[PDB]
Scaffold this motif. Structure first.
Motif, short mmCIF file in Angstrom:
data_model
loop_
_atom_site.label_atom_id
_atom_site.label_comp_id
_atom_site.label_asym_id
_atom_site.label_seq_id
_atom_site.Cartn_x
_atom_site.Cartn_y
_atom_site.Cartn_z
N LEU A 114 0.81 -1.21 0.00
CA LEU A 114 0.00 0.00 0.00
C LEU A 114 0.84 1.26 0.00
O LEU A 114 0.29 2.36 0.03
N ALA A 115 2.16 1.13 -0.04
CA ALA A 115 3.03 2.29 -0.01
C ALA A 115 2.97 3.04 -1.33
O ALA A 115 2.72 2.47 -2.39
N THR A 116 3.20 4.35 -1.25
CA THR A 116 3.14 5.22 -2.41
C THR A 116 4.45 5.99 -2.54
O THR A 116 5.11 6.29 -1.54
N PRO A 117 4.85 6.32 -3.76
CA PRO A 117 6.08 7.08 -3.96
C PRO A 117 5.88 8.57 -3.73
O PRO A 117 4.76 9.08 -3.73
N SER A 118 6.99 9.26 -3.53
CA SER A 118 6.97 10.71 -3.44
C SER A 118 6.70 11.30 -4.82
O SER A 118 6.95 10.66 -5.84
N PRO A 119 6.16 12.52 -4.88
CA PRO A 119 5.90 13.13 -6.19
C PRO A 119 7.15 13.26 -7.03
O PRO A 119 7.11 13.08 -8.25
N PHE A 120 8.28 13.57 -6.40
CA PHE A 120 9.56 13.69 -7.06
C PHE A 120 10.63 13.53 -6.00
O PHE A 120 10.34 13.45 -4.80
N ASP A 121 11.88 13.46 -6.44
CA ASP A 121 13.00 13.27 -5.53
C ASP A 121 13.84 14.53 -5.48
O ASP A 121 14.21 15.07 -6.52
N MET A 122 14.11 15.01 -4.27
CA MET A 122 15.05 16.10 -4.10
C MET A 122 16.41 15.72 -4.66
O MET A 122 16.97 14.69 -4.29
N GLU A 123 16.94 16.56 -5.53
CA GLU A 123 18.24 16.34 -6.12
C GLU A 123 19.22 17.36 -5.57
O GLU A 123 18.85 18.46 -5.17
N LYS A 124 20.49 16.98 -5.54
CA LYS A 124 21.53 17.92 -5.15
C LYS A 124 21.66 19.01 -6.21
O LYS A 124 21.53 18.75 -7.40
#
Lengths: 16, 50
Positions: free
Chosen positions: B1-11
């Protein structure tokens, strides 16, 4: 460049 | 039931660029320029025998 010029300051601000 | 983040913080990356250029030149043109092709001698003959 002459001592008081603005271009001399601009040169001093490059290559940091 | 886990969901991903909308996007990933990049350096984040900062780029610093320097272009330096110096040009120098000298040009000289001196002396005396003389003529190098001149007319030569001429000779002509003409006669009416008859």
């Amino acid at each position: 460049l002459p001592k008081g010029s603005t271009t001399r300051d601009a040169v001093d601000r490059t290559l940091g | 039931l886990a969901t991903p983040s909308p996007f990933d913080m990049e350096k984040m990356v900062w780029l610093d660029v320097n272009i330096l250029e110096i040009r120098k030149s000298v040009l000289e043109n001196f002396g005396v320029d003389w003529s190098k092709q001149i007319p030569g001698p001429f000779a002509a003959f003409g006669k009416d025998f008859v």
